[PDB]
Design a protein around this ligand. Structure first.
Ligand SMILES: Cc1cc2nc3c(=O)[nH]c(=O)nc-3n(C[C@H](O)[C@H](O)[C@H](O)COP(=O)(O)OP(=O)(O)OC[C@H]3O[C@@H](n4cnc5c(N)ncnc54)[C@H](O)[C@@H]3O)c2cc1C
Length: 368
């Protein structure tokens, strides 16, 4: 009935393509990827709940998720002035390698008859709307209708995504104050051997530590020294070309214009300090499939999607931004007790409508 093009072979468009073709096996679903097949950004990611019971976890859509060596975390460890504070997590946290997750999802799509072409060249907007009935934009953070234009915001802190062989058995959140400034580590094990170790700092700490001038090797050794107590001699490794950045929060005022509809980070990115990015890609992928299924008029489904997607994407943005800003000012909270800092941390999103209730409601509609 329909010829859909998926732009971007990451979790958003992969979950969409497979779940769509599973709901509509006759449709012609194809995926194009900008990069080579081998290039996958990042190290590990933390995901909600365990497969296969938790519908927002992308592992719940792989037949044998345990073959990706996921790690299930039950504790949260907040370290302040070297004191640990150990809490239960509310939900099991699921760490998994980002590469294995992406490639298993791609393999799932290929086995369903969904072609994925790599290193694709850019196509006119005109070329695509002649060539296709719907263009699912899922290229993460190109030519699109003017009303889909993005609002971009750069966070104040600088961050870098490290990997390390230090094993962080709990979800770790580490605060370390330097003669140079305030450094924050987000760390958690995702495999038998590897942990994610995301470091953000103050723009003044970035300047006083001279991080822009140092070599990558020098900067990593300095940060590993800062977190000496957490890393125990293990170094820090970044991916080629993935240095220090300001987090880019991309928002949009409409989810779809014409035959272009957006999902994933391309529709809304949000700071990683709430760990919801891949969760949102799944939830909104599953949302799009349900609108494209429930009603038979495409345009009428897209207007159903845009009125359902956008409140959800913006509540996500509000929660991530509330968390991001707290981490941008946390230097002023450093004299607090561990207990007082933890209470501050737990309340940083409390003024908003609960995100989790909104996500469960949307999943209830997209899955019945
Ligand atoms: C430091 C950091 C830590 C994070 N930690 C977590 C975490 O713990 N848990 C979590 O769930 N999320 C985490 N995230 C977020 C997570 O990486 C993303 O939110 C998630 O990948 C979004 O999926 P997506 O498919 O929308 O985008 P992407 O994963 O970026 O996929 C988009 C794909 O499209 C491709 N593409 C780009 N442009 C084009 C084009 N023109 N044509 C075709 N293809 C194109 C890209 O190369 C990419 O392969 C983190 C992010 C950062 C930066």
């Amino acid at each position: 009935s329909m010829k859909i093009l998926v732009i971007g072979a990451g979790p958003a468009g992969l979950i969409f393509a497979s779940q769509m073709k599973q709901a509509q096996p006759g449709w012609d679903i194809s995926i194009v990827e900008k990069n080579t097949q081998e290039e996958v950004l990042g190290w590990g990611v933390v995901l909600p709940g365990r497969p296969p019971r938790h519908p927002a976890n992308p592992l719940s859509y792989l037949e044998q998720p345990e073959r990706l060596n996921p790690q299930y975390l039950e504790e949260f460890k907040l370290v302040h002035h070297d004191q640990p504070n150990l809490m239960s997590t509310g939900v099991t946290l699921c760490g998994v390698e980002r590469r294995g997750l992406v490639q298993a999802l791609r393999a799932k799509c290929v086995a369903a008859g969904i072609a994925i072409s790599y290193e694709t060249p850019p196509a006119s907007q005109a070329q695509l709307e002649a060539e296709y009935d719907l263009v699912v934009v899922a290229n993460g953070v190109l030519q699109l209708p003017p009303s889909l234009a993005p609002q971009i915001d750069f966070g104040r802190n600088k961050y870098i995504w490290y990997g390390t062989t230090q094993l962080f058995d709990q979800m770790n959140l580490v605060f370390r104050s330097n003669a140079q400034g305030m450094f924050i580590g987000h760390a958690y094990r995702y495999s038998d051997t590897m942990s994610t170790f995301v470091v953000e700092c103050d723009e003044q700490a970035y300047a006083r530590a001279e991080l822009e001038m140092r070599s990558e090797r020098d900067a990593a050794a300095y940060i590993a020294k800062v977190f000496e107590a957490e890393l125990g001699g293990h170094a820090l490794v970044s991916q080629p070309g993935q240095g220090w950045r300001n987090f880019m929060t991309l928002s949009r005022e409409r989810a779809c214009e014409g035959k272009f509809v957006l999902i994933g980070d391309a529709l809304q990115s949000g700071h990683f300090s709430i760990g919801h990015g891949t969760t949102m890609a799944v939830v909104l992928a599953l949302l799009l499939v349900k609108t494209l299924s429930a009603d038979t008029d495409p345009v009428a489904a897209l207007d159903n999607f845009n009125a359902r997607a956008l409140p959800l994407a913006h509540l996500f943005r509000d929660h991530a931004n509330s968390s991001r800003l707290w981490f941008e000012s946390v230097a002023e909270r450093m004299e607090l007790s561990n207990a007082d800092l933890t209470a501050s941390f737990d309340a940083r999103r409390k003024d908003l409508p609960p995100l989790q209730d909104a996500l469960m409601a949307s999943l209830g509609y997209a899955l019945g």
